[PDB]
Amino acid sequence: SLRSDLINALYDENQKYDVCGIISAEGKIYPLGSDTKVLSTIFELFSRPIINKIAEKHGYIVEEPKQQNHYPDFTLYKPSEPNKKIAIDIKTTYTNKENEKIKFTLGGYTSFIRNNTKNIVYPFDQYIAHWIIGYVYTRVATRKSSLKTYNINELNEIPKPYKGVKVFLQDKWVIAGDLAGSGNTTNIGSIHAHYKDFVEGKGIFDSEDEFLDYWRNYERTSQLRNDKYNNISEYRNWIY
Amino acid sequence: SLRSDLINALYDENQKYDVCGIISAEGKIYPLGSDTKVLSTIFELFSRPIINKIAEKHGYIVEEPKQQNHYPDFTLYKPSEPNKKIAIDIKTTYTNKENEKIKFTLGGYTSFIRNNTKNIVYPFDQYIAHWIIGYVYTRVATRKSSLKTYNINELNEIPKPYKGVKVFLQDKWVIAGDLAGSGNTTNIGSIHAHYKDFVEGKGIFDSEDEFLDYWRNYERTSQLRNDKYNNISEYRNWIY
DNA sequence: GGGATATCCC
DNA sequence: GGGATATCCC
């Protein structure tokens, strides 16, 4: 199973998280910081070697998006059956101190979910599956960068911005919740839970329809969200 | 002074502003793509040692945010005059045909611009000058990242994400415009001209005052502002 | 012009 | 939760 195989190779098969810094054509190295906007990519870069791997020994093609504002990170599939498209999307998140509850943002709620074609490499329908690859790290901060330029020799010196990474795979609908992850950016939110709750997929929506419906009609303004619904209890009761 | 000194440094004191890729500690390199959220940060890393070296040589202390979502990136200050705080923010944009017109997005019009302390490192009132260090660049059209992992020796075979970089130092009110930069995120729009106009510091606003009142007044959307004001030439009369 | 990519702060 | 960094895409 693409999945089983996948999950398998994600948990240290020989993989080690060691990205120390950025490098300029001048040969001089600049360390990282807690910028999430860059860490994200670093997280995806760790996966890109392993997805493609499996994908290979399974006979599917992988297609990264050409444009900067389209979902999802990866698009696996076989030409023959070019309707059985799977979709993998990398999501990171940080912790401060050990064993805290986490949460991720699961993506747009007013895009291809409701539009089918808006911002997605392929029309929403060609996908049979949508997976999520979640990462958790202990951010090492109290930050203010590392005010210094390095060289190819001090690599070992270079401090990283993360510690004790944790990965897991799961279907999106399984770990989705009933609250926006981001406001203005209309994102969906994840379940507030213990990392392991994710592994196990101890969610809240009973199936993928329950997850689409809920999100399909999650009004955007609190004003309109009152006389309709704010959560699972609210929605469920809305079934009658 | 502090200002023109910075410029020299930032105007070919030798620097090239080129990046290669990401770099691990086992020494294995990974290339980059034109992704903005990344490039905007790398350009950042480049700027910090340049800034530090100048300030420090004029006896200024430097400040960086702890929160990743507060303004400004940099914060130079003289303790012998703590109320004389200056801001520096890196702003990037790209173009294909090495010449076409330009546009930047300089911050939110509904935060420190109207309440003194929302999402700002120190209070707005404690700042004398607000500077924009802008970078422009030609990006390899389309986008091809590839997944090869070079190394120090193959430092040359590695594809760069951009080429022909440009930089400018100028004041925030001189380069601002009368249209939004973005919408949902509520950002100020830089002027839509040509590199040079920027260097010229050939704007539209009359004063650092007009721009203030201006953006201080920007209604969040079409409905409201369409019957108030939608541009400076409109701002004007409205002022009566 | 409005909303889209990611995830975060108070 | 609402608004914030980064800027773009359509």
Side-chain angles (χ1 to χ4, degrees), chain A residues 37 67-70 182-185 222:
Chain A
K37 292 156 301 102
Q67 286 139 325
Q68 180 180 301
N69 290 339
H70 281 62
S182 99
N184 69 347
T185 37
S222 336

Side-chain angles (χ1 to χ4, degrees), chain A residues 183-203:
Chain A
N184 69 347
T185 37
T186 298
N187 248 249
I188 295 153
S190 133
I191 223 125
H192 212 311
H194 266 84
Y195 157 101
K196 44 92 227 266
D197 276 24
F198 289 79
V199 193
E200 285 158 23
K202 262 126 113 220

Side-chain angles (χ1 to χ4, degrees), chain A residues 20-21 27-31 148-159, chain B residues 24-25:
Chain A
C20 34
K28 296 270 246 108
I29 321 211
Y30 303 67
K148 161 192 235 270
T149 256
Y150 298 65
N151 118 9
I152 196 132
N153 297 134
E154 346 202 75
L155 284 195
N156 13 330
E157 292 190 23
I158 302 164
Chain B
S24 87

